[PDB]
Ligand binder design. Structure first.
Ligand SMILES: [Cl-]
Ligand SMILES: [Cl-]
Ligand SMILES: [Cl-]
Ligand SMILES: [Mg+2]
Ligand SMILES: [Mg+2]
Ligand SMILES: [Mg+2]
Ligand SMILES: [Mg+2]
Ligand SMILES: [Mg+2]
Ligand SMILES: [Mg+2]
Ligand SMILES: [Mg+2]
Ligand SMILES: [Mg+2]
Ligand SMILES: [Mg+2]
Ligand SMILES: [Mg+2]
Ligand SMILES: [Mg+2]
Ligand SMILES: [Mg+2]
Ligand SMILES: [Mg+2]
Ligand SMILES: [Mg+2]
Ligand SMILES: [Mg+2]
Ligand code: NA
Ligand code: NA
Ligand code: NA
Ligand code: NA
Ligand code: NA
Ligand code: NA
Ligand code: NA
Ligand code: NA
Ligand code: NA
Ligand code: NA
Ligand code: NA
Ligand code: NA
Ligand code: NA
Ligand code: NA
Ligand code: NA
Ligand code: NA
Ligand code: NA
Ligand code: NA
Ligand code: NA
Ligand code: NA
Ligand code: NA
Lengths: 115, 145, 246, 119
RNA sequence: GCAUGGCAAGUCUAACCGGAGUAUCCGGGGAGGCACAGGGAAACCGACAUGGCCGCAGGGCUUGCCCGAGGGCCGCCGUC
RNA sequence: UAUGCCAGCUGGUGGAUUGCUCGGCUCAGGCGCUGAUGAAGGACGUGCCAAGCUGCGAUAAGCCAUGGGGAGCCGCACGGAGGCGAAGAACCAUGGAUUUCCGAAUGAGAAUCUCUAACAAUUGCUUCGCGCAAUGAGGAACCCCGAGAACUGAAACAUCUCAGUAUCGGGAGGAACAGAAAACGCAAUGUGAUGUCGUUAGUAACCGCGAGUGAACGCGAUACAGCCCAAACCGAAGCCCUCACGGGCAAUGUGGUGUCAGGGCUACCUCUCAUCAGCCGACCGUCUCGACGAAGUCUCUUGGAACAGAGCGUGAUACAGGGUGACAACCCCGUACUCGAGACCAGUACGACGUGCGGUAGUGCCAGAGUAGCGGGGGUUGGAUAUCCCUCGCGAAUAACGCAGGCAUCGACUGCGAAGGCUAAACACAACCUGAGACCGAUAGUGAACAAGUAGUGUGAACGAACGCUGCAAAGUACCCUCAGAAGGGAGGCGAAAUAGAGCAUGAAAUCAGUUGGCGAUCGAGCGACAGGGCAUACAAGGUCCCUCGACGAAUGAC
């Protein structure tokens, strides 16, 4: 009963990758997205900066928000980013859509889940 | 299909015995009735407590934590840079219908800051100086004695 | 992307950059919600007379005559819901708020999204429109705004291989139901939407199933009638440009 | 008034002088060219041709015009009663066309000719 | 409370104003509300952008061993 | 196999159902008072024939004028007879005539009539004469001022609540009311008449501190507008009636000045563009009404009828809606476009006429009393000590004074001048006009689509229904037989259809007559479910089924 056709498609793609490729994060993210919006992740930069590390893609099974400061040069992949978040992140790293992540790494390797 | 939509034919619409859904007696009284008797449970106790000072003898302090200021120093490009120097009064929203602006010391301070505000807390001060900063008290701030 | 501008003869005449908004991801759900709201908000409040069926002193005799305790007057039942001529138990109410709210953001998004659905030849085709063109929307010189005769706009459309859609909308449906008794006897398919810049195309408005709008206030309804994205549209050189900032 | 009920009502209750427009009929190609009007208010003097009923095709002179019932009697357009008598079959001007006009009225002819008024 | 959806340290406009295709609709309007700090009758004061330990999912590795968001158990801080 | 059971068929009864809508319901814009110059309402009249409704008033479904309109007409109402209209009728708009009796009802009385000139009654002016005038009553609600419940809630109940609600008395208008601070009190170096809308806020405040009740300043908007007396100083310089003459008012003060940017007075400066009075007087907009207004009524087929199918063609600043013998942009009304008129905005805005604003210095000349204020008692309010009001008693100052800033007193500070008055606009309602609709669609929706506040009930206050649909066209059934017969019936005629024949579209069920299938006068009662047999069955929309044998063959499993 999701309404967003896009969110719906992302979820189907996340599965196709988790099944075909050896990914497990993708299937993991898919299940959380299938869950009620209220349980989805709403992460600010402060937390990403605190537990992320370079050369390890940050995966947010939700949306990323721009509160706080991010200095580490990391690649963050989320369902969506507030405009401020995506601006602060591209200043020191790279903001990426989950759909790109699934394509540049269907194996879901070297990835860290943050929520 | 919603719940209501499925009620036709149930006779009782989920009310149990048809002798149930009548008047206020099924509610044990109208409104807050029995908040002291049969339904005292989960009602704050009865009684008066304390007092209030006249509304116009009250002062509302506009507050902000150092962490906020600090996290957006660079972003506040439209505010003095020196050996940064920021007049809090110009940062804090609601700083108009406010009897005065006060800086609170929550979070860290990773820059050398010169803060001008009507008031500061110990923590705010220690932290701002600790980062090689200073705290300037406004003329209004001249109300300390 | 590129937009092929057409002259009043139907011949290519240079081309402009298709603004970005036409690239906004098509979100039929949001579109649908904007059309739903627009349609709800123009619905009029109604309800029965507050006193219908209560205008009487009918009383119930109570026990004693082998009669059910129903209010009666002149030996005729009255007032109560189950009686003929009695009150409607839970009738329509003037007080009811039949309007729908919608965040300006969510609404503008749908406008943008509807706009974008316009530049997708497949969608437009699925929505049902009839035409033999590859590029869409149809862009035209501002000289279009000067046309005066409907007939002239027709030739231009026939030359743009889009008249077929008006042929489609050139059929009225006589509805099933009593709407008929209320003045809603007919209904017809929606055809082309003409978006101009200065004023709505007087010359095109009478076209079968056509709707004329202006770039500054063109909305979700005209862009996506019935909440269905992809309406065969024709913008004006200038219109196209204005639309970009909506 | 887009509402059917109101439309029908105003047509049925229109005062007498407003009914003249209900007894109007198209003009032959020639006549339309001659007076620059598409139709005219059928008068008991005009000749007319039946374009739609069971009498379609027949021509005759307009014998009577009833404003209340917005109907006209055309000569020879009749019905056989049980007793053998012949009575007129009312016709709606909408199914009729004027081929000849009775212009004995200065006023009517004047209206017909002018280009700012129609008769 | 819940499901879906938009925006996110913010969010939403109300009356009302302009436009117009004239009750829809496009634009404007942040007055004000809730959220962003709490504690205390009041005066008044005013907090962890993370210090430690377990550990699920997930990731990594030389396949038990590391990293371990969320979660749990503590510390520590504001205030009475 | 009587009485009879079940199902169906033909006919009926009944009026559901479907379809239709001349009526409702609701929203929205415009507009908005009438009356002694006798209203609103009622009564009785009024037609060739006239019972109801509508109109009208002894000039009685009407008379006259001007404009529109047009060859027809004589209301709903389609009969018979007769008549009117080119001397321009009908019909519509505006204005005018007539306009019985009761009715505020006013000469007096009275159930709509009667008795012998009449503003009855109460008032103002007054030529002190009803001479000149006012009031009265109506109106859908809205508005303002008074009087003021209870059921109910509090799970009982008294304060409290319901609620200043219902109901009552008085009264205005098209809107009312309010209104230019003895204000506010984000306390300020700040705001600046008043309604209203949004918010402030379910906040402050109240309350068997229970249940409940409940603002304001401010802010954002709407619309904006500011003035006149009393007095000081003048002192008849004045006002009303009347054509005039003449009369009346007025020293108990008409009139000038003046009104917190305080004023007056005295001496000065400058000036008028404020204000007040009067003249003129709209645009635009909006609501309604009206004029003009494009393009097929072509072919073949079906049909009673083309507005259907197929084919050919056309307009469109007009493809809203309606009508027309079936689905119509092009057959008719209309619709887009353009144009005109009335009403409202408004005797407003603008323009102009007259007046004269303002400033300095001096001056204790003037500035609203049962008041401000205190006390008793009640009511009301969120108003708590700190709401507003009534009642009883007491009771002040004089701007060098006074009142307010949410307890009292004194001082300071800030604001502001009560006890005189007026005031446009923005807001309420919905009688009236018009528009609109995811409203209802004849047991619905109004009580009322119909004779509807009708028939009918009650002494009376008051109560109060049901009834929509022939057909394209009345072509609404001639003639003949029968009959006591304008009844009914038979035969016949019209129409696509009479099983459309008059409360006549469709025509359900309960149910009735006749009739078909099955059962039936020796037999037992939840009327059936599932199995299996008899008998019965036009087509259609289901096409399967039977027996020998043979293949396969779970659990089970022999003689
Ligand atoms: Cl976070
Ligand atoms: Cl307090
Ligand atoms: Cl203020
Ligand atoms: Mg603010
Ligand atoms: Mg009813
Ligand atoms: Mg139906
Ligand atoms: Mg002419
Ligand atoms: Mg009398
Ligand atoms: Mg009680
Ligand atoms: Mg109690
Ligand atoms: Mg008021
Ligand atoms: Mg109260
Ligand atoms: Mg206040
Ligand atoms: Mg004066
Ligand atoms: Mg009270
Ligand atoms: Mg009824
Ligand atoms: Mg019938
Ligand atoms: Mg037995
Ligand atoms: Na339940
Ligand atoms: Na029940
Ligand atoms: Na209770
Ligand atoms: Na207790
Ligand atoms: Na009644
Ligand atoms: Na009974
Ligand atoms: Na409503
Ligand atoms: Na705000
Ligand atoms: Na009016
Ligand atoms: Na009569
Ligand atoms: Na009269
Ligand atoms: Na009088
Ligand atoms: Na007298
Ligand atoms: Na109780
Ligand atoms: Na009791
Ligand atoms: Na109480
Ligand atoms: Na303020
Ligand atoms: Na016709
Ligand atoms: Na008192
Ligand atoms: Na004050
Ligand atoms: Na009925």
């Amino acid at each position: 009963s999701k309404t967003n056709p896009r969110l719906s498609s992302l979820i189907a793609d996340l599965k196709s990758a988790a099944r075909s490729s050896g990914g497990a994060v993708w299937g993991d993210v898919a299940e959380r997205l299938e869950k009620p919006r209220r349980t989805h992740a709403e992460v600010n930069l402060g937390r990403i900066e605190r537990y992320a590390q370079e050369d390890e893609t940050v995966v947010v099974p939700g949306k990323v928000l721009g509160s706080g400061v991010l200095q580490k040069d990391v690649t963050v992949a989320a369902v969506d980013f507030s405009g401020t978040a995506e601006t602060k992140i591209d200043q020191v790293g790279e903001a990426v859509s989950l759909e790109q992540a699934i394509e540049n790494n269907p194996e879901g390797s070297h990835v860290r889940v943050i929520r | 299909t919603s719940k209501k939509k499925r009620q036709r034919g149930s006779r009782t619409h989920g009310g149990g015995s048809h002798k149930n859904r009548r008047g206020a007696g099924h509610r044990g009284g109208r409104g807050d009735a029995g908040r002291d008797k049969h339904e005292f449970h989960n009602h704050e106790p009865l009684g008066k407590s304390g007092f209030k000072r006249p509304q116009k003898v009250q002062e509302e302090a506009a507050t902000i934590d150092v962490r906020e200021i600090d996290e957006n120093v660079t972003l506040l490009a439209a505010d003095d840079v020196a050996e940064f120097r920021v007049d809090v009064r110009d940062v804090v929203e609601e700083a108009d219908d406010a009897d005065y602006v006060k800086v609170l010391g929550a979070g860290q301070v990773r820059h050398e800051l010169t803060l001008i505000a009507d008031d500061f807390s110990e923590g705010a001060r220690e932290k701002v100086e600790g980062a090689g900063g200073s705290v300037e008290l406004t003329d209004l701030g001249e109300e300390r004695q | 992307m590129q937009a092929t501008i057409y002259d009043l003869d139907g011949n290519t005449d240079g081309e402009v950059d298709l603004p970005d908004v036409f690239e906004t991801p098509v979100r039929s759900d949001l579109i649908g919600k904007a059309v739903r709201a627009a349609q709800a908000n123009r619905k009029q409040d109604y309800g029965s007379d507050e006193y219908a069926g209560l205008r009487t002193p009918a009383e119930s005799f109570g026990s004693g005559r082998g009669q059910a305790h129903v209010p009666k007057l002149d030996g005729r039942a009255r007032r109560v819901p189950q009686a003929v001529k009695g009150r409607s138990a839970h009738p329509p109410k003037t007080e009811k708020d039949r309007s729908l709210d919608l965040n300006d953001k969510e609404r503008q998004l749908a406008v943008r999204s509807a706009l974008a659905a316009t530049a997708d030849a497949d969608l437009v085709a699925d929505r049902g429109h009839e035409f033999d063109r590859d590029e869409v929307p149809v862009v035209v010189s501002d000289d279009f705004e000067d046309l005066v005769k409907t007939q002239e706009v027709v030739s231009l459309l026939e030359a743009l291989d889009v008249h077929a859609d008006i042929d489609r909308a050139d059929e009225t449906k006589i509805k099933a139901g009593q709407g008929s008794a209320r003045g809603r006897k007919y209904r017809r398919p929606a055809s082309i939407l003409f978006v101009t810049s200065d004023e709505p195309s007087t010359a095109a408005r009478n076209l079968a199933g056509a709707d004329v709008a202006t770039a500054s206030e063109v909305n979700t309804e005209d862009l996506a009638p019935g909440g269905a994205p992809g309406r065969l549209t024709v913008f004006t050189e200038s219109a196209l440009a204005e639309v970009a900032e909506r | 008034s887009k509402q059917p009920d109101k439309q029908r009502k105003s047509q049925r209750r229109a005062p007498l002088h407003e009914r003249h427009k209900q007894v109007r009929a198209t003009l032959s190609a020639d006549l339309r060219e001659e007076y620059g009007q598409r139709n005219v208010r059928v008068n008991a003097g005009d000749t007319v041709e039946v374009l739609r009923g069971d009498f379609a095709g027949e021509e005759g002179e307009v014998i009577n015009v009833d404003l209340d019932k917005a109907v006209i009697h055309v000569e020879d357009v009749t019905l056989e009663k049980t007793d053998g008598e012949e009575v007129p079959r009312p016709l709606d001007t909408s199914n009729v066309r004027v081929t000849d006009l009775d212009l004995e009225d200065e006023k009517r002819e004047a209206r017909l000719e002018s280009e700012d008024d129609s008769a």
